[PDB]
Design a protein around this ligand. Structure first.
Ligand SMILES: Cc1cn([C@@H]2OC[C@H](OP(=O)(O)OP(=O)(O)OP(=O)(O)O)[C@H]2O)c(=O)[nH]c1=O
Ligand SMILES: Cc1cn([C@@H]2OC[C@H](OP(=O)(O)OP(=O)(O)OP(=O)(O)O)[C@H]2O)c(=O)[nH]c1=O
Ligand SMILES: Cc1cn([C@@H]2OC[C@H](OP(=O)(O)OP(=O)(O)OP(=O)(O)O)[C@H]2O)c(=O)[nH]c1=O
Lengths: 132, 133, 135
């Protein structure tokens, strides 16, 4: 895991499986902007707003939503998935992204979106950097 | 460029990502016959019926279908991919064919399958000729 | 036919255009070591680990990567290029290596990296040997 310098993330999406009442739109947009800033400092810029950002409920929504993403957004590079703690959703994310569709997926715990820290944003960058 | 003489396309497939309701079997068979004729006349004959011809929908279908093709038809030379206009399918077809599986692919817009003209068939032949030549 | 004696391959690189998911690090390291062994037995020893070993994707990556290689690794003798099969990358590799930069490049199919046999390693040795011998 030597860090890669050449990465640019142009097309990406957010799928929020945490409840909106806990993880609101402002929490998500705040999170997005802070993630963009750190990714820029590290020389793996996330350009742009996500091309898609929706709430969803249930592990069974993962495959349909990811197929939808792949089928709708040309060149989609990354899906960031927000999770409400321990969940069957995580398992469903992993199999679909890593073994079915071959698309980079990164999960994040809702609590790190509600109150973001540079350390957790850094962790997410490093993981994305490895994946991409 | 230079056109290449002496190419023969013996094993080829059609993957149609345009909806069947717009691009029916008879449209595809008619298209195939016209392509056969012009390619023969130009001395790069696309010989025979395709070894495979199936509909699919979505960029997500590309990799599974092409893995199937690669694994089932040894000596597959070409996949002709019919596209429904602007689509994430094109990008995925190029990624899978050129990078993932290593398979020659030529895309064609559905509107040129629904009504063929000599000029669009010629375009397609020349592209195939360059790719396989 | 005409195998060349007395060649030593000291500076060489691997550029893998097959996806990592298909052609993993262990596949590449295993392939490298097997290639070194047979090439040593045949008297064209690969003296070291490659100076560079990276994944890349797309014909558009070829020229930049090869320029990097040429400019960074003095006396680079060989680039081994792993390809998934028929691909516009093959054409671009030949154009850039043979006409743009002038460095010896040898392509190999991903399936022969994933699982080696003595016969396919031998094939690749002979081709490397031919390209490197000369004035
Ligand atoms: C089991 C479980 C785990 N997590 C954590 O969230 C992502 C983080 O790490 P990750 O898996 O993303 O780490 P990674 O090495 O990049 O590998 P994968 O993401 O491909 O699995 C993981 O530790 C949850 O939030 N909920 C859960 O229920
Ligand atoms: C860039 C782009 C192009 N097209 C056009 O539709 C078929 C035609 O095919 P093309 O002659 O380009 O040949 P192709 O097999 O697409 O591949 P190349 O070998 O030219 O790269 C291509 O120009 C799309 O439908 N979507 C796109 O996003
Ligand atoms: C489909 C495919 C096949 N092969 C075969 O494997 C050895 C030999 O090698 P190739 O003649 O293709 O290429 P090469 O030695 O670098 O030769 P030159 O182009 O310098 O003559 C070629 O017959 C590839 O290597 N790459 C492929 O993708």
């Amino acid at each position: 895991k030597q860090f890669h310098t050449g990465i640019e993330i142009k097309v990406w999406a957010i799928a929020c499986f945490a409840p909106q009442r806990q993880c609101t739109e402002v929490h998500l947009k705040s999170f997005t902007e802070q993630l963009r800033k750190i990714s820029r400092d590290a020389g793996m810029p996330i350009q742009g707003q996500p091309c898609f950002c929706k709430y969803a409920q249930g592990a069974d929504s993962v495959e349909p939503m990811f197929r939808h993403l792949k089928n709708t957004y040309a060149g989609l590079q990354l899906v960031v998935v927000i999770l409400p703690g321990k969940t069957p959703v995580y398992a469903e994310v992993k199999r679909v992204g890593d073994t079915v569709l071959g698309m980079a997926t990164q999960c994040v715990q809702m609590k790190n979106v509600q109150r973001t820290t540079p350390q957790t944003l850094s962790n997410l960058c490093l993981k994305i950097n490895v994946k991409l």
